[PDB]
PDB file of C-alpha atoms and ligand atoms in Angstrom:
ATOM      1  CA  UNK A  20     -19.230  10.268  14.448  1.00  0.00           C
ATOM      2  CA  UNK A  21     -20.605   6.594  15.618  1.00  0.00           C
ATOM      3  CA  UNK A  22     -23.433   7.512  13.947  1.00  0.00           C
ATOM      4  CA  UNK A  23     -22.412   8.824  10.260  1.00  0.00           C
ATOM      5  CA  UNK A  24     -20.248   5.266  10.618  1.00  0.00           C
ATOM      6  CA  UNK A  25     -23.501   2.716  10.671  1.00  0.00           C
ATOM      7  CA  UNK A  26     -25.289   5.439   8.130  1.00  0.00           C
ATOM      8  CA  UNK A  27     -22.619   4.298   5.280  1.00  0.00           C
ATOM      9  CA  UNK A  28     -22.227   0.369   6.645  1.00  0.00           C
ATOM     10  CA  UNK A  29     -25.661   0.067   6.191  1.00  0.00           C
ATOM     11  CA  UNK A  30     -25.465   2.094   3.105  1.00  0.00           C
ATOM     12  CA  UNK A  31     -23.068  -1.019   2.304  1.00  0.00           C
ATOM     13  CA  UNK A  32     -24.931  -3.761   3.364  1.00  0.00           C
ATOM     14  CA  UNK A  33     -28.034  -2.822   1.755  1.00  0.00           C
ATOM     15  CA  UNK A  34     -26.031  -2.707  -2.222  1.00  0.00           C
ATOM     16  CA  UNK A  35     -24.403  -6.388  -1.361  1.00  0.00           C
ATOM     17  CA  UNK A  36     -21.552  -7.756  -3.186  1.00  0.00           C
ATOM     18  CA  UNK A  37     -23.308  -6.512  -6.461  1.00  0.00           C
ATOM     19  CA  UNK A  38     -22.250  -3.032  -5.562  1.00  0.00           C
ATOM     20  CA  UNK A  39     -19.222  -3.322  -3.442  1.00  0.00           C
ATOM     21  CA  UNK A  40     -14.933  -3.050  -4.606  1.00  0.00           C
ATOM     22  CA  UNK A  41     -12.619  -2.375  -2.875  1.00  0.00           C
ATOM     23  CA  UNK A  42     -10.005  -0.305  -3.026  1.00  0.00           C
ATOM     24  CA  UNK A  43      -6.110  -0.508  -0.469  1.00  0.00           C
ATOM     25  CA  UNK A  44      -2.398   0.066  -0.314  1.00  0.00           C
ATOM     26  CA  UNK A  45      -0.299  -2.609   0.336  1.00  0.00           C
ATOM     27  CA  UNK A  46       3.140  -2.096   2.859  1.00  0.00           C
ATOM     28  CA  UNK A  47       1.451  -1.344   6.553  1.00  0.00           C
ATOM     29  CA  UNK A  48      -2.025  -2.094   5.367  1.00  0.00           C
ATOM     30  CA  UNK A  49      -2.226  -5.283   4.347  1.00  0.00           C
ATOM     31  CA  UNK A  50       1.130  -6.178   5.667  1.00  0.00           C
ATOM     32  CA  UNK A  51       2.115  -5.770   9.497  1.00  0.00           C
ATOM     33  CA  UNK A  52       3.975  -3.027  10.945  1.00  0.00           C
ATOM     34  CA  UNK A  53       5.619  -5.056  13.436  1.00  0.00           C
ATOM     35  CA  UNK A  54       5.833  -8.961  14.880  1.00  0.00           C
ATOM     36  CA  UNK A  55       7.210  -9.987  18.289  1.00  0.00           C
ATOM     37  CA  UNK A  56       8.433  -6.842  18.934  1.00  0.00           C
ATOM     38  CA  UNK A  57      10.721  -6.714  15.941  1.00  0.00           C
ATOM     39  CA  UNK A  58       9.956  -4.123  13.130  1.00  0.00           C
ATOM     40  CA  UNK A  59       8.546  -5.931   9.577  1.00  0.00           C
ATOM     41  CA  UNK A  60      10.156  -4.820   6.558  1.00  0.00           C
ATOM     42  CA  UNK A  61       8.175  -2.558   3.745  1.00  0.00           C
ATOM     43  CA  UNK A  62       8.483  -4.092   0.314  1.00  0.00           C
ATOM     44  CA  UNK A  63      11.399  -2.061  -0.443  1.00  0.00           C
ATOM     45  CA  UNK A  64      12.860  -2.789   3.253  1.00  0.00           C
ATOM     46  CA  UNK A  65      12.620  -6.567   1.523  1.00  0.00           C
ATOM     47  CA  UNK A  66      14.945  -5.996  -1.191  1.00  0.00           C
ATOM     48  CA  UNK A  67      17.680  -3.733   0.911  1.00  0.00           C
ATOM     49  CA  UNK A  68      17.834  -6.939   3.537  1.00  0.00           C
ATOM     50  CA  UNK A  69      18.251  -9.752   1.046  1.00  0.00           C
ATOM     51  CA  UNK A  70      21.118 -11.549   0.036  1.00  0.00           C
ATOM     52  CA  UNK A  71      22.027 -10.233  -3.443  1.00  0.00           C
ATOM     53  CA  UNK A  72      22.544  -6.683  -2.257  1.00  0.00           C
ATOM     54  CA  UNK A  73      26.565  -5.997  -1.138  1.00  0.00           C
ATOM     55  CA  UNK A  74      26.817  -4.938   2.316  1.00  0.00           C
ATOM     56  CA  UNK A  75      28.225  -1.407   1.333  1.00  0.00           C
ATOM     57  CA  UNK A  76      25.138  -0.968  -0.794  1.00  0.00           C
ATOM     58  CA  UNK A  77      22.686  -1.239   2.092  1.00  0.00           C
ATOM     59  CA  UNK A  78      25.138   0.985   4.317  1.00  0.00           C
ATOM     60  CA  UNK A  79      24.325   3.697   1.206  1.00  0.00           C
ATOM     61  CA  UNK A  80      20.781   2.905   1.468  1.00  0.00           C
ATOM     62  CA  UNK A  81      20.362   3.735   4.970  1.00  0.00           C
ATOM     63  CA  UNK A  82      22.127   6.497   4.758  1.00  0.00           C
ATOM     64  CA  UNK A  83      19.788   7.792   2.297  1.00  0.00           C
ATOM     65  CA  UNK A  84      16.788   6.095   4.326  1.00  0.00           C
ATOM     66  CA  UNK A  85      17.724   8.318   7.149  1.00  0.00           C
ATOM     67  CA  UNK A  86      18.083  11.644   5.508  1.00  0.00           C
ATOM     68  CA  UNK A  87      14.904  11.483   3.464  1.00  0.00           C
ATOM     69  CA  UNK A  88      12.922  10.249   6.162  1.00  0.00           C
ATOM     70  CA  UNK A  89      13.791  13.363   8.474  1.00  0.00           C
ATOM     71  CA  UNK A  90      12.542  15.065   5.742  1.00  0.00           C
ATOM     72  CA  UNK A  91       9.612  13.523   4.834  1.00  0.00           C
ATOM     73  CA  UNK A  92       8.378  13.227   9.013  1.00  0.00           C
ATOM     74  CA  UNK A  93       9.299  17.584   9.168  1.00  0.00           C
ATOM     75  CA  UNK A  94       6.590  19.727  10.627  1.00  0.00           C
ATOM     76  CA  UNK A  95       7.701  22.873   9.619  1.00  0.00           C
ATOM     77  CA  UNK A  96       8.154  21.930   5.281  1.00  0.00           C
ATOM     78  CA  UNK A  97       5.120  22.279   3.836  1.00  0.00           C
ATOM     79  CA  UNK A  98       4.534  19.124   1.239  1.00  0.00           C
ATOM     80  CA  UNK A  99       5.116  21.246  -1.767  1.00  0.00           C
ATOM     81  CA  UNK A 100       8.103  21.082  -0.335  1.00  0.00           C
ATOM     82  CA  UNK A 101       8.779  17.839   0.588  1.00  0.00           C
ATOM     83  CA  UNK A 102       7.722  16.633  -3.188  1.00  0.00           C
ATOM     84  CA  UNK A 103      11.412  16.883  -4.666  1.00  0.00           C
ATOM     85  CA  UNK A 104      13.265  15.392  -2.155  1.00  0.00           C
ATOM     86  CA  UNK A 105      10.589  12.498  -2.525  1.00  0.00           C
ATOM     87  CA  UNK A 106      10.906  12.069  -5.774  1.00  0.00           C
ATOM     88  CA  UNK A 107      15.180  12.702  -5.278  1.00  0.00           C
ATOM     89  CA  UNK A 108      14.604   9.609  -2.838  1.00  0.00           C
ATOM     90  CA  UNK A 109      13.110   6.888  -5.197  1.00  0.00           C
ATOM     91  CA  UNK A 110      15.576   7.992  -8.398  1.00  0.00           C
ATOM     92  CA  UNK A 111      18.643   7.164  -6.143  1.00  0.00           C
ATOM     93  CA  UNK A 112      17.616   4.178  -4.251  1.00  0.00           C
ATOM     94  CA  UNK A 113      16.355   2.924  -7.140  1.00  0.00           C
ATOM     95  CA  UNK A 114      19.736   3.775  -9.147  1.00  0.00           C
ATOM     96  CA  UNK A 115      21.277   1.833  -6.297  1.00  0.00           C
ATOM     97  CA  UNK A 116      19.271  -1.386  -6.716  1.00  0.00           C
ATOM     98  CA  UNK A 117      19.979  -0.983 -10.519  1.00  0.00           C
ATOM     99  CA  UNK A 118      23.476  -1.243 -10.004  1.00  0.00           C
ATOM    100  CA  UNK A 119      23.308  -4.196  -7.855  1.00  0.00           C
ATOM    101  CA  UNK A 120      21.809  -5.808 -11.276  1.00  0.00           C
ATOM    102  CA  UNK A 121      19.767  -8.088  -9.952  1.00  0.00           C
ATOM    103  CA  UNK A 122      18.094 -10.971 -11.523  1.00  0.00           C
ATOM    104  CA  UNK A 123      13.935 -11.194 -12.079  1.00  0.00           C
ATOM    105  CA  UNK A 124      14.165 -14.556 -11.500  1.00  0.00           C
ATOM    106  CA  UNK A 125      15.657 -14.260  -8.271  1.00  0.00           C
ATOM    107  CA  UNK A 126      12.565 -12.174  -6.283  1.00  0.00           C
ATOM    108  CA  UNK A 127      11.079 -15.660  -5.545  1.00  0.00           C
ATOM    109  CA  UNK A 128      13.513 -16.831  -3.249  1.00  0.00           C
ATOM    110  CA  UNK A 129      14.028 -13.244  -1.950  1.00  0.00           C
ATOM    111  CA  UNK A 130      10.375 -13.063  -0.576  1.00  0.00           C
ATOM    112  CA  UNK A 131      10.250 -16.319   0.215  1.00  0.00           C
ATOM    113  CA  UNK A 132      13.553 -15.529   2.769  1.00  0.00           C
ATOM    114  CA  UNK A 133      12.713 -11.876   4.238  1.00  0.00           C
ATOM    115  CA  UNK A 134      10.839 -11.620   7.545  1.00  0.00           C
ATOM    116  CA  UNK A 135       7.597  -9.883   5.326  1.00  0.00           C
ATOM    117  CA  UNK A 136       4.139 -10.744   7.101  1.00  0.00           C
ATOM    118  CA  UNK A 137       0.774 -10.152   6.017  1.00  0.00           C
ATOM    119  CA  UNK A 138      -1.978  -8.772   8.967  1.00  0.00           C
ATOM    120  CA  UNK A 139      -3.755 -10.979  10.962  1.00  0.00           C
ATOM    121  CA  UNK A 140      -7.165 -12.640   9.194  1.00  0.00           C
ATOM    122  CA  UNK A 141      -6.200 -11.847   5.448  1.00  0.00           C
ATOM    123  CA  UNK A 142      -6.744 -15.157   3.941  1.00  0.00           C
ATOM    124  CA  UNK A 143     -10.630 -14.551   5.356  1.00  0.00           C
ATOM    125  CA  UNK A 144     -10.346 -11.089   3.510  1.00  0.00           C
ATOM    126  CA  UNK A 145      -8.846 -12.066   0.042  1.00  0.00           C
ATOM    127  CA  UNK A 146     -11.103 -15.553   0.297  1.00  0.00           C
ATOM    128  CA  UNK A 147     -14.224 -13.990   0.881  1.00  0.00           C
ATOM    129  CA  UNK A 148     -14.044 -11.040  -1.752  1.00  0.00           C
ATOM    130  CA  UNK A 149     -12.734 -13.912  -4.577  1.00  0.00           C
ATOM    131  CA  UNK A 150     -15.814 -15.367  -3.925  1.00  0.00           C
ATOM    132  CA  UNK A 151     -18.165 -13.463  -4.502  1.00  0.00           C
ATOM    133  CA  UNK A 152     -15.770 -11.360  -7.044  1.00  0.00           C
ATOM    134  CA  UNK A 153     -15.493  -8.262  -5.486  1.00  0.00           C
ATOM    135  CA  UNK A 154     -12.779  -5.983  -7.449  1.00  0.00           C
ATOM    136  CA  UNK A 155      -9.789  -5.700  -5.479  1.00  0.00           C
ATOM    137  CA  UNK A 156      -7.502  -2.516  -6.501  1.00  0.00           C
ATOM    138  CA  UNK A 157      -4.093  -2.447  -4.886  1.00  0.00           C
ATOM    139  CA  UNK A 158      -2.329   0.955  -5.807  1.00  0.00           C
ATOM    140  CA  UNK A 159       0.907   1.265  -3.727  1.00  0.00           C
ATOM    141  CA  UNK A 160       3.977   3.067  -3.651  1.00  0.00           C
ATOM    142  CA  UNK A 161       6.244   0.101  -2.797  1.00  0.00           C
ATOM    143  CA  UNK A 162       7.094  -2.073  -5.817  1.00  0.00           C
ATOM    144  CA  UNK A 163       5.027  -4.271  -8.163  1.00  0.00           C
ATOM    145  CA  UNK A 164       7.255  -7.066  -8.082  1.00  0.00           C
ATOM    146  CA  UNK A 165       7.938  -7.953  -4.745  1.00  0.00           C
ATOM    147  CA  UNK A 166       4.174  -7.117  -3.549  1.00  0.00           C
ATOM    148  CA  UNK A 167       2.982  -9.804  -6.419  1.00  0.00           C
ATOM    149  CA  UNK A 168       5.504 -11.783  -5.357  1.00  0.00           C
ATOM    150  CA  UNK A 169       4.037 -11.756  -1.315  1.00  0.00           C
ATOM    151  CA  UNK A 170       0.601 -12.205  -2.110  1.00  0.00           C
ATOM    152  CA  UNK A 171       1.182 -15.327  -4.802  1.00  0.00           C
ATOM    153  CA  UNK A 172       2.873 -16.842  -2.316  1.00  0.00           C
ATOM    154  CA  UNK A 173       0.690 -15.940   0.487  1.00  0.00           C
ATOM    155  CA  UNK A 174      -1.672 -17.777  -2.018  1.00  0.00           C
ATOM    156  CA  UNK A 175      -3.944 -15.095  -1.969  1.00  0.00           C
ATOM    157  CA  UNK A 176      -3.232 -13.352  -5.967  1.00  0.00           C
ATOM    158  CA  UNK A 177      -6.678 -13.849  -6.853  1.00  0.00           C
ATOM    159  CA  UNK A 178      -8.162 -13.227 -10.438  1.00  0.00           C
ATOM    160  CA  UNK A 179     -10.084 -10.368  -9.222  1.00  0.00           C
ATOM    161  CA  UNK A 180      -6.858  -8.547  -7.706  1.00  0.00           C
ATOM    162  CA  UNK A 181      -5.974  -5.375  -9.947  1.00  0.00           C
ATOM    163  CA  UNK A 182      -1.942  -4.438  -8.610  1.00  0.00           C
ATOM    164  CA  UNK A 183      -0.788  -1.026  -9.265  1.00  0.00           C
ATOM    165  CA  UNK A 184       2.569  -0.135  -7.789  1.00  0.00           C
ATOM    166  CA  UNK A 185       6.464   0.826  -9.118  1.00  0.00           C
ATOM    167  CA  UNK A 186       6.599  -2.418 -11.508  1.00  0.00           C
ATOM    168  CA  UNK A 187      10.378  -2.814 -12.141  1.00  0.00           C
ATOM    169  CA  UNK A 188      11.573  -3.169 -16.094  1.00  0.00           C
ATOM    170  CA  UNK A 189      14.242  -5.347 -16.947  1.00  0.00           C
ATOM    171  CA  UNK A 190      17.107  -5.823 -20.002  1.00  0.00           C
ATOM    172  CA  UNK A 191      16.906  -9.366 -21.750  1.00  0.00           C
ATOM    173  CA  UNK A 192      19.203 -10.933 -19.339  1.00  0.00           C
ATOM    174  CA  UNK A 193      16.338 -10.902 -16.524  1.00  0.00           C
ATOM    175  CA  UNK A 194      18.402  -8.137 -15.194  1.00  0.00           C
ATOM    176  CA  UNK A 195      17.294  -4.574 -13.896  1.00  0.00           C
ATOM    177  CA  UNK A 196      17.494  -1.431 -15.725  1.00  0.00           C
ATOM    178  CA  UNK A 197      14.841   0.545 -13.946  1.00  0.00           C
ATOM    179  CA  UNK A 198      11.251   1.377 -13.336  1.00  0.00           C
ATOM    180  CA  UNK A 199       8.048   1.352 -15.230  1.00  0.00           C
ATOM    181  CA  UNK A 200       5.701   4.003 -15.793  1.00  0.00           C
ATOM    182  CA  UNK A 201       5.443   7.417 -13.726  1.00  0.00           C
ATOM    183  CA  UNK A 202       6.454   6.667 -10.231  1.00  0.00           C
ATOM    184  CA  UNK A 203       3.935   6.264  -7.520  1.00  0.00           C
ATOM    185  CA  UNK A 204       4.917   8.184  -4.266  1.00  0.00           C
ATOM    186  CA  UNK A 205       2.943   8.491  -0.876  1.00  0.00           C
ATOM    187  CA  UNK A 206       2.128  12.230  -1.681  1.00  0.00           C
ATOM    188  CA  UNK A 207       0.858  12.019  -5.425  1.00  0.00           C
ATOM    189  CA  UNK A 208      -1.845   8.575  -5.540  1.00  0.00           C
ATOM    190  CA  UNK A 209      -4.670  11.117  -6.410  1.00  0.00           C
ATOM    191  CA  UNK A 210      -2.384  11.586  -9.744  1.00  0.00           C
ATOM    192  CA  UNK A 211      -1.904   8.124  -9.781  1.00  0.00           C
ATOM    193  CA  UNK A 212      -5.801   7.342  -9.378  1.00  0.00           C
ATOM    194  CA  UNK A 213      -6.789   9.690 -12.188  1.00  0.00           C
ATOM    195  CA  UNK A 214      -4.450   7.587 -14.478  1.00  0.00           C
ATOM    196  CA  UNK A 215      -6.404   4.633 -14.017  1.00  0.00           C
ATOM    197  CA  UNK A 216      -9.524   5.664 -15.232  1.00  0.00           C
ATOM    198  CA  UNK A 217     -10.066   2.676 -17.678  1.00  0.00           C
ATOM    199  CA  UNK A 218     -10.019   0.212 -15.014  1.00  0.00           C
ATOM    200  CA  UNK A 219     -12.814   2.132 -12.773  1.00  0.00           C
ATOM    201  CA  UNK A 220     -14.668   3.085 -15.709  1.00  0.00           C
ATOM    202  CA  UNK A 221     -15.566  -0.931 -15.726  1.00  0.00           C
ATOM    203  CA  UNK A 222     -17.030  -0.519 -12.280  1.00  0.00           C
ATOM    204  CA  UNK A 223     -19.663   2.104 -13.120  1.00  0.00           C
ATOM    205  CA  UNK A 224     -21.733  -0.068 -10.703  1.00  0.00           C
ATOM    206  CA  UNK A 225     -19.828  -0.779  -8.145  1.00  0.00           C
ATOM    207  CA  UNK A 226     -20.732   2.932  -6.301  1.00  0.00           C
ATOM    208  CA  UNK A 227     -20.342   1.258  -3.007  1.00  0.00           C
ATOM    209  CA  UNK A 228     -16.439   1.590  -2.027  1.00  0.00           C
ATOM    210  CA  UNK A 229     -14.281   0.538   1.400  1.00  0.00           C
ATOM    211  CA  UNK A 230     -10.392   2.318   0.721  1.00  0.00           C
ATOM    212  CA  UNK A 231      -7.849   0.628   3.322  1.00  0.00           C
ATOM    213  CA  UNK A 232      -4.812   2.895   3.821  1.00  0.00           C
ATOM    214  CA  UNK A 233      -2.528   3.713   6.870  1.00  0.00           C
ATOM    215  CA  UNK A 234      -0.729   7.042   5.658  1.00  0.00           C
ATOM    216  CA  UNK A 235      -2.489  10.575   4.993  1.00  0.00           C
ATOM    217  CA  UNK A 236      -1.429  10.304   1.698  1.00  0.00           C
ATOM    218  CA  UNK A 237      -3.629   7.084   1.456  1.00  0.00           C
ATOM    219  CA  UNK A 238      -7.132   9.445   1.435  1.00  0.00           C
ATOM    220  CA  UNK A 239      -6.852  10.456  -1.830  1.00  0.00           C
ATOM    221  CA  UNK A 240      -7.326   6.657  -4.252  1.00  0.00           C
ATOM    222  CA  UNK A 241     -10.766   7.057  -4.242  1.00  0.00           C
ATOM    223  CA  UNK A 242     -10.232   9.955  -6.351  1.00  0.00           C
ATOM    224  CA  UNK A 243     -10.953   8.309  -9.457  1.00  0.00           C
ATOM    225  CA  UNK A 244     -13.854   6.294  -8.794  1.00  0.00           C
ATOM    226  CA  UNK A 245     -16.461   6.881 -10.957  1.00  0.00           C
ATOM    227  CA  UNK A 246     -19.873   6.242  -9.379  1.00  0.00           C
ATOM    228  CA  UNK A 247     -19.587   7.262  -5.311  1.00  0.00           C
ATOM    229  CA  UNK A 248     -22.623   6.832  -3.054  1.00  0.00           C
ATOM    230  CA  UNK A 249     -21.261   5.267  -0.392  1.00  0.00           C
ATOM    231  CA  UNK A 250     -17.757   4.979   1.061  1.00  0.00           C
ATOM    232  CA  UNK A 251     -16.020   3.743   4.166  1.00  0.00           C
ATOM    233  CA  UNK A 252     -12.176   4.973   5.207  1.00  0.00           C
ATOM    234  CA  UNK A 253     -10.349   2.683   7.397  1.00  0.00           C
ATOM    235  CA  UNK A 254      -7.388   3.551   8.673  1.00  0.00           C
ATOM    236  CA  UNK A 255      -4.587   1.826   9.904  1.00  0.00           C
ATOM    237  CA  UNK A 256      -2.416   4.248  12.717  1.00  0.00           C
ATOM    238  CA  UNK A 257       0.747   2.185  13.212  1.00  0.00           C
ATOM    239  CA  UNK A 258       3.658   4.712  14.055  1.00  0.00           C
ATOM    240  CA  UNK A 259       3.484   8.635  14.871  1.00  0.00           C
ATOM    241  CA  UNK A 260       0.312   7.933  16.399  1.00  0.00           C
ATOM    242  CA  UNK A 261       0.588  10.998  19.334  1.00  0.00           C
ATOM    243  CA  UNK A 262       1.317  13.588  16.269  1.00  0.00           C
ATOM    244  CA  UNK A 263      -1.549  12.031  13.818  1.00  0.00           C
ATOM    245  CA  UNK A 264      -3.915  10.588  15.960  1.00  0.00           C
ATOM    246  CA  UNK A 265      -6.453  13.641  16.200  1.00  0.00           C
ATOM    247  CA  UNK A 266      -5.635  14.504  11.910  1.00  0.00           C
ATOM    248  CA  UNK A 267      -6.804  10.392  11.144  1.00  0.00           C
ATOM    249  CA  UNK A 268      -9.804  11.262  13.370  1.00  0.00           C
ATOM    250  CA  UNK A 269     -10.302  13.594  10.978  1.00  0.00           C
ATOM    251  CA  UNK A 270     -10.273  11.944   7.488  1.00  0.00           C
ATOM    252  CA  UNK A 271     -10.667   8.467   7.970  1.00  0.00           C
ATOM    253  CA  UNK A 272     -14.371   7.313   8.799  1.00  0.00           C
ATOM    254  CA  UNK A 273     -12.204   4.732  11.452  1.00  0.00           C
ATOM    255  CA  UNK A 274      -9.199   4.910  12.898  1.00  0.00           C
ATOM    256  CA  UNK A 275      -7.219   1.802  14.437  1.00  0.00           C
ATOM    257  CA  UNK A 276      -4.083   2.496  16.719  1.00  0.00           C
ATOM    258  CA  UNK A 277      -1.513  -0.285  15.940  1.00  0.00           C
ATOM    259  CA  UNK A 278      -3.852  -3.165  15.214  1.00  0.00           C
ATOM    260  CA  UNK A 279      -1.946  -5.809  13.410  1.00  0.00           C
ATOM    261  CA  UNK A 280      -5.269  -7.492  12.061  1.00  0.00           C
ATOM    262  CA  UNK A 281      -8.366  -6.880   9.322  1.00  0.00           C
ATOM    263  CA  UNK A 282     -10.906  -8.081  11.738  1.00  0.00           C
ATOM    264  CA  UNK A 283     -12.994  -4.980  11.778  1.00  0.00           C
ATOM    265  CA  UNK A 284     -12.970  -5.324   7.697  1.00  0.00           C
ATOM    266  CA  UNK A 285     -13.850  -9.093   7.580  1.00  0.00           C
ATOM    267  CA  UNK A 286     -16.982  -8.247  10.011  1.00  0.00           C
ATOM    268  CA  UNK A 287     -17.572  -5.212   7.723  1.00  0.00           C
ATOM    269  CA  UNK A 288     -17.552  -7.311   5.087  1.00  0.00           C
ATOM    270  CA  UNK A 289     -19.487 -10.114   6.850  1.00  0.00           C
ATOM    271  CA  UNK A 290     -22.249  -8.369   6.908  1.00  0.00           C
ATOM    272  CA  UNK A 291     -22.136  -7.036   3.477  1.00  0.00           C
ATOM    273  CA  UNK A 292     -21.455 -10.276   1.165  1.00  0.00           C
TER     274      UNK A 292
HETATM  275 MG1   MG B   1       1.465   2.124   3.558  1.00  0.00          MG
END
């Protein structure tokens, strides 16, 4: 509905900056899709391209990236389903980057080198909501590192930016030995919201919310939000658009097919701050 849309806008606009976070995934959402007709790389896409990863490695990791994705993209497997073979994916891609050993101190030059790109307008977006200190909560299921590693250099890591993600953990040589934490996954972020409770619980006042996601699984990190009185879902369609189109209809409060920019969220939010 058009009109449900400008009910919680100017539920927004009326609560101003003292009311507003905002809360987004990273890969597809804040970074493009695609560029010039070439396909941009997720943060993990990132580290199976770059230079310190042997050629027969990434041959293994599309391989995997093949078979998982059939399964993850299956109409007929219910996600209950699908859940194992997720979490099978992560534990063996990831087992394959920790055997490639590589070095913390080497993700700098790795971004810096990878064909990563960040949506049209987003210095407007991460300038505007520094200033006026609007919490920023980035809860992906890519990996901490790398995202940090965009946005710092992107020159857009500002102090009010909360990251959330798959941080990597390292030995004492600066070397990889595995993951952080309890993985984040694109079906589980309402388990992964409910974890974060201490940081929301700060934000009793901010009850007025916009969540930026692009998958289905995106919906649900609003779940632990404390105070809710008024929220806006945008979402970002890039890819299986014909088989999702009419379910994103559905959920989100606005749906954009393949737009590689946050212009409608920058005029959102010029009207809020
Ligand atoms: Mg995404």
């Amino acid at each position: 509905n058009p009109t449900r849309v400008e009910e919680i806008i100017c539920g927004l606009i009326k609560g101003g900056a003292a009311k507003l976070q905002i809360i987004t995934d990273f890969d597809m959402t804040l970074s493009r899709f695609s560029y010039k007709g070439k396909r941009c790389p997720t943060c993990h896409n990132i580290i199976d391209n770059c230079k310190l990863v042997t050629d027969e490695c990434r041959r293994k990791l599309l391989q995997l990236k093949e078979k998982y994705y059939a399964i993850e993209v299956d109409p007929v497997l219910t996600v209950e389903e699908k859940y194992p073979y997720m979490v099978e994916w992560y534990t063996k891609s990831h087992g394959l980057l920790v055997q490639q050993a590589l070095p913390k101190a080497k993700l700098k030059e790795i971004v810096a080198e990878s064909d990563v790109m960040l949506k049209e307008g987003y210095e407007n977006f991460f300038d505007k909501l520094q200033q006026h200190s609007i919490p920023v909560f980035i809860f992906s299921a890519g990996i901490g590192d790398v995202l940090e590693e965009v946005i710092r250099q992107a020159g857009v890591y500002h102090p009010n930016v909360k990251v959330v993600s798959n941080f990597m953990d390292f030995d004492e040589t600066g070397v990889l030995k595995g993951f952080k934490g309890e993985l984040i996954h694109v079906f589980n972020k309402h388990d992964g919201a409910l974890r974060n409770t201490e940081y929301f619980n700060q934000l009793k006042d901010n009850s007025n919310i916009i969540l930026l996601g692009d998958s289905q699984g995106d919906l649900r990190m609003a779940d632990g939000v404390a105070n809710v009185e008024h929220i806006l879902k945008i979402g970002y369609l890039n890819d299986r658009v014909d088989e999702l189109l009419e379910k994103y209809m559905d959920s989100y409060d606005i749906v954009l097919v393949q737009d590689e920019s946050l212009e409608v969220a920058n005029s959102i939010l010029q009207k809020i701050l």
